[PDB]
Structures are given as C-alpha cells and as structure tokens.
Amino acid sequence: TVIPIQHIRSVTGEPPRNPREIPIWLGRNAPAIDGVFPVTTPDLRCRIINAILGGNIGLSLTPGDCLTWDSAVATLFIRTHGTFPMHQLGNVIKGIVDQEGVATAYTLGMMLSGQNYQLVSGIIRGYLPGQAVVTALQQRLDQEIDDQTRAETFIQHLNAVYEILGLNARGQSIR
Amino acid sequence: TVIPIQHIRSVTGEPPRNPREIPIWLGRNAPAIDGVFPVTTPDLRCRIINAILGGNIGLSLTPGDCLTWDSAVATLFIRTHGTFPMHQLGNVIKGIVDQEGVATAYTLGMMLSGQNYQLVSGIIRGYLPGQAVVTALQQRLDQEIDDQTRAETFIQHLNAVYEILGLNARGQSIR
Amino acid sequence: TVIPIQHIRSVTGEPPRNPREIPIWLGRNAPAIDGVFPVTTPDLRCRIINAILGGNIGLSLTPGDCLTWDSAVATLFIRTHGTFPMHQLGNVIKGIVDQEGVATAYTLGMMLSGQNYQLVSGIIRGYLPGQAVVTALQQRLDQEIDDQTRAETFIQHLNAVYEILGLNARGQSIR
Amino acid sequence: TVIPIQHIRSVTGEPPRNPREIPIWLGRNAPAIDGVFPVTTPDLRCRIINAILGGNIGLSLTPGDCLTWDSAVATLFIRTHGTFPMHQLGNVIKGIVDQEGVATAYTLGMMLSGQNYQLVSGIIRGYLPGQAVVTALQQRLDQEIDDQTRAETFIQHLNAVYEILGLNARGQSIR
Amino acid sequence: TVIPIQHIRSVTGEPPRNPREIPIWLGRNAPAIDGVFPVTTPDLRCRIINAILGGNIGLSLTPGDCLTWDSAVATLFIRTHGTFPMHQLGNVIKGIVDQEGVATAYTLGMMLSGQNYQLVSGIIRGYLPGQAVVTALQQRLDQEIDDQTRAETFIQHLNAVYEILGLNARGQSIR
Amino acid sequence: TVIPIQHIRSVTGEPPRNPREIPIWLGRNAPAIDGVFPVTTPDLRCRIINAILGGNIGLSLTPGDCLTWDSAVATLFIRTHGTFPMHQLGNVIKGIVDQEGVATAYTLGMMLSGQNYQLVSGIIRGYLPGQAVVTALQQRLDQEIDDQTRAETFIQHLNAVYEILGLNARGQSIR
C-alpha cells in the first residue's frame, strides 16, 4: 500500500516544537485522522505516526508500541516526560482543563489512564466550573445502568448541562 | 474511502480562530465543499466537518446532528451563541443586510436559526428598503396558505416586489 | 464522480473581484475548462461553477440554472445587475457589444428577452460595424424560411460576413 | 477522457504576450508535446490547444481546424496576422533564420507551406551561411533517390555539413 | 515502478546548505521516508536518496553503497569529511554524542571502524552521562557470553538503563 | 504512456539559457532525473531530453544519439563546442577542480569527452595537488592490466593515495 499522507497531514497540521506538548497534540487529532482514513493494523498506525512527526530525535515508534492510539500516546509520554503517564494523571488533566476544556481533558484522560472511568471521572469532578454544574451533571450519570454506559454518555450529559447554564466549552459564561 | 481533505481546504481556505465566527463560515462555504466532494449520508458529513475544524474536541459533532448542512450549522450556533440569542441573531442579520442584501440575510439567518420562519421573518421586516416594500411583500405572503409555504415563496415574492420598484439586490435603484 | 478542481483552477485563473464583471469572465474561460475536463451533464456544470466562485453564497447555482454554459451566464448576470424593464434592453446590449462584440451581446440578449428574435435582432442591427455589414447580413437571413431558422443561423451568418471583410470579434480590422 | 494539462504546460511554458508571436511559438512546441503525451484524434488536439492558450487571449479552435498540427498553426496565423501565411512566405522564413537558424525555419516553413519541400528548399538555399555550405549540402541531397526522402534527411544532412565547417546552430563560427 | 517523490520531499523538507550536516540529517529523517513509502531493496534506497539530493553529482550513491540506511549514512560521511586515522575516531564520536547522543554515535562509530567493538565500546564509556550509568551498563554487557553478543545487545541495554534513571536520548534528565 | 515532466522538472530545475552551459547541466542532473522516473529504451531517453530543452529544435537529439546518458551529453557538447575542442575541455575541467575537487572533475570531464580515458587522464594529472600525489597514483594505475581497467579503478586509487597523505575531497589537509 501507500498511505495518503497529503490528506492526513491537512487534518493534523504541523507539530509543536516544545517536545513535551506532543503526546497531547497527537492525542486530540487521533479521532479526526481515524475519520479521513481507516487505520486498522498496528503497522499502519506506526507508519502514519512516524510520517506526521517528521525529523524529531528519539521519537519514531515501532509497530510493537502502536497497537491502540492509547498505547502509542502513552509511549510518546514516557519518552518525553520520563515518568509513566499514570504517576501524574492529576496534574496533566488539570493542565488541559485550563487551556482546552473538560470534554478535551476527559478524552486524553482516558487515553493516558487506559479507559479507567472511575479515576478520570473523579479527577474531572474536581475541575468542573462551579458547584451548581457538579450537582447537575451527577444526577444524569447516576441514572445510567453500568459504568460502561456512563463512559459513552459522559460528553452527551456535560453538553446538555452546559446548555442550561449557558457556558461555552472552555467554561466561561455566554449570558 | 479516503476523504480528500487537501482539495476541500484548497477551495474553502482555513476556518477562523474565534469560534463565534465558525457557524457562519461553514454556512457560506457549504455549497463549495459539496461541489469538490459530494456528501450523501449524515455519516460522511460528520467525518468531513470534524476533519475541517481539525483538532477541536469542543465543537465536534455526531451523526445525530448532521442530517443536513443546515442541521449541522444550527447545532454549532447554539453551542457558541447559546439558545435564544435573539439580540445576537438580530445583529448578525443586520450586518449581512448592509454588505450583501436581504435575500442573502434571509437564507443565512434561516440556516443559523433551525429554519425558524416566524423569528427570522420578523427580524428581516425591520431592515427592508422603505415602507412601501414592507406592505407590498406582506400582502403577497399573506395570500399563501401555511407557514411552510411562506418559507418556500419568500425570496420569490421579495424579487417580484423589488423588480416593480426598479431596485437591484442591494436595494438601490437601476432606473 | 471526481472533478479535477486544482487543474481547472490553474487553467482559468482567479475570478475578478468586482462581481459585476464575473458573468462575462465565466463566458471567456468556458472553452478552456471544457478542454481540461469535458462537462457533459448540467449537474457537473453546477459543481464546477460553485467550487470556482468559492465562498460567495450569493452566486450559488442549481442544476435548474446551468443546463447550457449560456443559461448559467444569463442567471449570473441577472443576480449581479438586476431584472430590467424591456424598454431598457437596448442599453444593456449596447454596453456588452463595446466589451465583447455582437456574437456575445446577441446570445445573452436572447436569454434576457424570452428568446424573442424580432426585439434583439432589431436592436443589434443598429450597433454593427458599418452599412456594408448590415445589408450583407440581411440577405443571408432573408434566404432563410422562417424566424425559427433565422434565430439559429444568426451567429453562423454574422461570422461568415466578418470573415470576408477581415474583422476581429470586436468588429475592428485585423490589419 | 481527462488530459494531463499539468505536464504539457511544463513542456511549453507561458504563451508569448504579443499575439503575432503565438502561431510560431505553437509550431516550435508541437513535436515535444507529441513526445510527452500522445495526440491521435482532432478532438484531443483541439482541447490541448484550447487549454494551453487559456482564455485571456480569446483564440478558440474547433475539431474541424485542429485536424493536423500544421492545419491548427495555419488557422491561428490568419486570426492574428489577417493575411494567409502563403502571402509572404519568404518574409516569414527570413525572420526565423535571423533568430533560431536554418533548422527551425525549415521546420516551420514546411508547416505553413503545407509540406511543399520543392519551394521551402528553394527559399532556404538563399539564406544559408556561405557558398560552400550551399554547394556541400546540395551534393548530399542530390544523391538521395526521391524528394519524399530528401525532405526526411534534410536536417540530418544539414547538421553534418555544419559540423565539418565548425558552425553552431545559428550559422556563426564556433572558433 | 515510479516512486512518490513529491510526497517524500514534503515530509523531510529541504536538506541543509552545509554538506557536512547532510549525512546525519538523512539518519534523523529515515523513519519518515519508510512511513510515506516502504523502501525494501537497495535499488529503491538509491533511487530515493539520489532524487532528494538533486544536483549533487558529488554525493550520488549506487545500489552497492546502500544495502541498509546505516551504510548510506556512513558512505555519505566518508565523502563530506574524508577517511581519517585510528587516533582521530575519538574527536568524531565525541562531536556526535554532543549533537545526537550515544545510540547514534555507537552505530556510526561501529560503521566508520569496521565493527571494532572493543575500540568503539571503550571510547563511548568516557562520554556516558554520569558514573552510575557507566557502572550499570558495564554489568549488563559483562554477563553476556562473547564480544559478538555484546556488540548486538549494546543499544538494548543502554536504553533499559537510561529508562530506570529516567533520561531522554540526548542523555539529560526530564523529571 | 505519459512522461511526467512536472515531477522531473521539480527535482532538476529550469535549464540554463546560454546553450554552451547546457551539456554539463544535464550531466549533473542525470542521476536525479532517472531517480524520479526510470528510463530504459534509447527512445525514452530521446523523448525526455527534448521535453526538458523545450521548443529548442537546434539542440534536438534522435534515438540514434541516446544509447546511454553519457552518449547524449557527448553529442550535445560537440554541437556547441566543436570537434576536438581541447583548449575548451581544459577549462571546464580545471574550473570544476577548483570548486568540487578531482573526483567529480574526473566523472563529469569523462562524460563531456565520450569516455576518452587517455585524454581526461592527461588533463587532470596537471591539476593534482603536489608532485608526490602524481607519482603514487601513476604507479598504482600502472599495476592494472587494460586501459578499460584503469578507467574503472581511477577514483578508487585516487582515494587510497589521498587517504595516506591525509587530504579531504577538496585537496585540503585534515590534521
């Protein structure tokens, strides 16, 4: 095969030069890249990741690393931050909430941790924008069946509760 | 099934930064997008929209919100301006009437509103060129049988009235 | 299908900024476009025109408008100039013969005036380049059996008289 | 069905601005265009000329005119110069020998005249660069069996005689 | 086959202006090229390198010189610097562990030295990043069988130790 | 069967205007051209060269002249510089020796000369750096059997001699 790199690299754009911003940059373009091209085999994830990173030192992956987007995003964290990602999940989540917003930090949160709803849910509930929201969001997530049902319906609920109070993704008033 | 994003960007350009300026940019550039690469289902429209807006998780859509290029546009306007933003919808429409004219202000307004004949009809009738037009246009639309039918035959009737009086699109004379 | 946009756009160039000029510009670059990519169906004209004129939602066409290159140019004229009273058809046509010449002004002239031969034939007669050409043309049109055939063979006969006298499209001498 | 217009436009270049230069510029570039992409039908030859010229010029041809490259080059000469190319054949050939030398002027002179070897040879014999070149070239051409084959091997024989005297393509002395 | 050069040449970028900088630039950018287009044979490595470096008849390789990317990078090194004697292998390697770090310098030193594991292991032990690394790495290599296994397990151990101590490739702490 | 002239010409660039400068320009760019697009038959070599030099009939090769790249470049040298142009071939060569060193000069200087070992050997020996270089290279080349052999091993032996004395490519010291 040959990967359509002309296209994939228009969705994504050019990467950040500060190289401990990279795992979060690749983390939040992954959903888009999967729409524009079906990435099925770990060989193609590795090929795509290595193409879009270009000439950066020590930052090529192996197909061993790139089994899921998570596993890859965790491996590029370990080679930049030095630590494992799940020895500072708290600080990383808080840092994203402040720049990008809750629905972003939720998403990267469950890439880095490894689809651990319990933990990431609890760390986020900390950084929600005001007490009122926290109570609102909680009663919606308590009326699902399982924690498997809650990890699909979490963004759907946050987006409904922010409509009522009139806030804007980054958690500021529209009003 | 490679969505050719590089070509679609060649025609539309880059979307704005200030995400209050995204919902109209998407309505304006819609019939260009659809000429380069023709969409068919909601599925594809989702995959195209998300890929254009890039690595933005906050303004990401789902198939549910994308039956039509209008349903997509409406959903984004409620996330950015909030519901019942009637003073702002007043202001985006008054702006267009001055640059473009009333038949453009009508279609963009009706797109951003979720095809709300009653609201947008009302706003435009305050920005028409002079008392005699308002009255002539209304008498024609009142003869029509229901509100679905008025929304169909509005640009039609506005033209007929503007032609008699000898105005061009921007409501200035050609006699 | 797959419309070769970035090739078509290399060949035509950029559409002019004052949009009153567009309609005559889409006429001159038609036989170039048909070179690069043969436009068969009206659905394909719409797609190509819409992608060229970019994010200008004022000028978007439908299959309904663009059946022939001349139908499409006629519509785009109406929207940039306005619908005229018949008594002013003369003043539109004159203008065009000074830019483009008689064969242009005839064709648009019949589109704008419900394809009526008597009116626009009678108007054009006035603006030909010299007495000789006028009588030269008539005799060829007076051998024809009815006004239906005259309406077809008008361009054909006009070119044959301009050949003989040694005149360019604008009706001046080639030297 | 879709011609490679990107590749052909690299081989030719931009057309010259002064349109009395166009009909010879197209004669020089023809045999290279035949190499890059094969041109078999009139309908193809038409399209390639119409796309190269580009619509700023307004020199559109038809599948009747573009039958053979010489018939196309013939037609464009009339619509710029106003005369027939056979009105002054000497004064065209003498021009092309003063810039590009004998082998260009042989090649366009056969194009304009309609493969009239007997005439074009008789004209160019006058403009050759010195008595012994003339008498040396006319020894070789008199040795070959017929005139069909003389017109084939003419440039093959000319390049030889320029070698043995040490002149370049523009008939100047190399030393 | 024809190779996708325009795509490869958009992922790597322009090669540096000083040609002593070229042989390492090519090592950094190898994995990217393998991403765009998987390079399988020595032939295809040659074709790709020769096209990227363009007009340099100076640095053009053959299939002999490029079996593996590490052969090419060595051959290109010998040209741009010159073959140097044993006592100068010190200043070559120290120069590189400063730019790129131990893993790069080990692989090139083993290549510019005819795989002299005792020499290139000895020199690299002076430029390791702290005494506790020097000692930890030694123990792992020591409990291997012979020098041939030690040569092929070196980079495996280096990285394992660098991981525990939490260093990046350039050999500096990131915690 | 399209020759892709836009890809080739993105790697080589635009050939120089002064027709004396061409033969060496095509020598330098030869390996990069066959990197982008693999030639095989003499036919295709002919077709690519004529496409590049464009609408230039004065420098137009035939398949007879194009067995190899070198055979083309020799023939084009003889059309522009003369037969036995030995003062001229002196200065192209000494020129390249003072920018790019002896090993390029031997390779280019050989193509321009149609692989005339004894002539290009002779020229270069008088630009080598110092008397001790000349004796040693000569002894090593003399130990060879045939004159064909000597031209296969010439660069190899230059670099042995150069590497004892401790010189780089450009005849500069490396101590």
UniProtKB/TrEMBL annotation, chains A, B, C, D, E, F:
UniProt subcellular location: Host cytoplasm; Host nucleus; Virion
Coiled-coil residue windows: none
Function text: Involved in capsid formation and genome binding. Shortly after infection, interaction between incoming particle-associated Gag proteins and host dynein allows centrosomal targeting of the viral genome (associated to Gag), prior to nucleus translocation and integration into host genome.
Annotated protein name in UniProt: Gag polyprotein
Whole sequence portion shown: 303 to 477 of 648
